[PDB]
Symmetry: D2
Subunit: 169 residues, 4 copies
């Protein structure tokens, strides 16, 4: 995660967030540097749960070409704030997952922040329904991140090159 001074901000989340339209495959496009990051080509696949919330299956391509995957469950602990989710990954403690912005069909902006006293740890990701996203959409989502203090200059562009990422197919 990205660690820096200050307490977690509380940005606005997506209004009338509809988890049913958020299901399916998302590609990782851009994100904060992540000390724990294993790989490239990252996707998140969200699916139906017979309980509440939805199920999570994330996949990434390690430098050696091995695919690393993790399974999880996503639940909105407050049903009146359906965009403020808790993610329960196998063998992980619970972490927050906030959908700050999505149009369901093209893009989403996700934020996770955990307080560490007078510092905090964050994930922040731009994702896409495709392995790329238009520069115009990226710049708008970067504008949203700068409005709660994310340094857009620090964001890393994920490797989604078709040949490099072919091991994912």
């Amino acid at each position: 995660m990205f660690i820096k001074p200050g307490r977690c901000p509380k940005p606005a989340v997506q209004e009338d967030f509809d988890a049913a339209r958020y299901l399916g495959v998302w590609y990782d496009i851009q994100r904060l540097p992540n000390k724990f990051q294993k790989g490239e080509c990252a996707t998140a696949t969200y699916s139906l749960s017979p309980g509440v919330g939805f199920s999570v299956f994330n996949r990434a391509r390690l430098a050696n070409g091995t695919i690393k995957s993790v399974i999880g469950s996503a639940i909105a602990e407050d049903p009146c704030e359906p965009a403020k989710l808790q993610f329960f990954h196998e063998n992980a403690a619970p972490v927050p997952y906030w959908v700050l912005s999505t149009d369901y069909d093209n893009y989403a902006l996700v934020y996770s922040c955990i307080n560490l006293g007078a510092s905090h740890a964050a994930y922040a990701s731009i994702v896409s329904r495709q392995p790329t996203l238009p520069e115009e959409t990226i710049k708008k989502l970067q504008g949203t991140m700068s409005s709660f203090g994310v340094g857009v200059d620090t964001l890393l562009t994920t490797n989604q090159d078709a040949a490099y990422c072919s091991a994912m197919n």
Copy 2:
């Protein structure tokens, strides 16, 4: 939930709890009074989840013969404490669910407590793999409940009459 003096106790939970063996159908036998309890003939069905934890489907027979059902998800937030679950029901805030004692094939004793300052609210339930449970097992589980301050003569016996409950089939 039943409101009583004192902060939540912390009873011992089932050693080496195995959620796989805990899945399937449980019948409500006896429980604490519950002001918003709907119905009798109550069952809990626990099933596989494609993410973490397991999925919850509870059913009860309302007075006019309708079956009320609720969907939920159960997750052990700490995998080293697998008998201390959080239940996430549609339309409810998270509640704890502690498996105090089970032999998986006959009985379980479950407890849930939320602190209210110097007072608390609790659920406590004896459940069975059949619509009845032997008196000797009920008595042993009442003894466990009395060891952390549950009053035995508050417990209600659930109506599990085969004719009254036949709408459940």
Copy 3:
């Protein structure tokens, strides 16, 4: 605490809340029924703390003329939300304390809610800098309470009779 259907509401809190001006003595005027309420003539005294937040000293007149007192600490866990405090009483688990409305020199409306699955438990109190408060102010604060579902005809009027309460002096 008073148990009712529904999950906790989230009423608006006092803008620009200034704990320094909120210190000193407050008299209980009206509150929700409270099964473990001890006494009448209730006052809350808030004082400086050498750490963060402020210190709490609550007093009430028991039926046999003894004064019951409790010590606590109040901390706003998020300094950007200074009217959303946590109160830590001797012998109690943490409880929320939200200053919904105050003019610092006459009245305050305080609210505390804890979720119990699909139901909740709450405290709600109208307090005054004097042992009485004008009817017009009581009526306005009842209107605020009714806007998030408090039933006005549940509220109890605290005994603040100068002769009955004289043991408090």
Copy 4:
């Protein structure tokens, strides 16, 4: 804080922890590397609170000779676990503080852990009533830390040199 893979461990805390005997001045002797650490010569001063818990005043000597200090409040949220404290520092989010071991008159071992998904952030400190502690006591407290996975090889010895730390007097 020190960040590494895995979830927070839950080590045993000091039995019958008595906050009254823990009050006064403690010197920082040894601790985990701390990405947020400002200075050397660190002391913690714990004092009476008119509310619950105790008040905190920490001081350290920066490389330029300026003294940095912070104020805080310490509260045990569960009165039955008085060694498991929450520390509320001015402008910080709440952080845990566990007294793992103390004899009140010579030494204490303190641990703080916050989960970051499949990693965690920790503080771990050996403190003393004096600017030094016997090697025998340090080695015993290091044994306690190794028993829940702390790498004693990573611990840093705090500069408590009388001449360097004279700016603290």
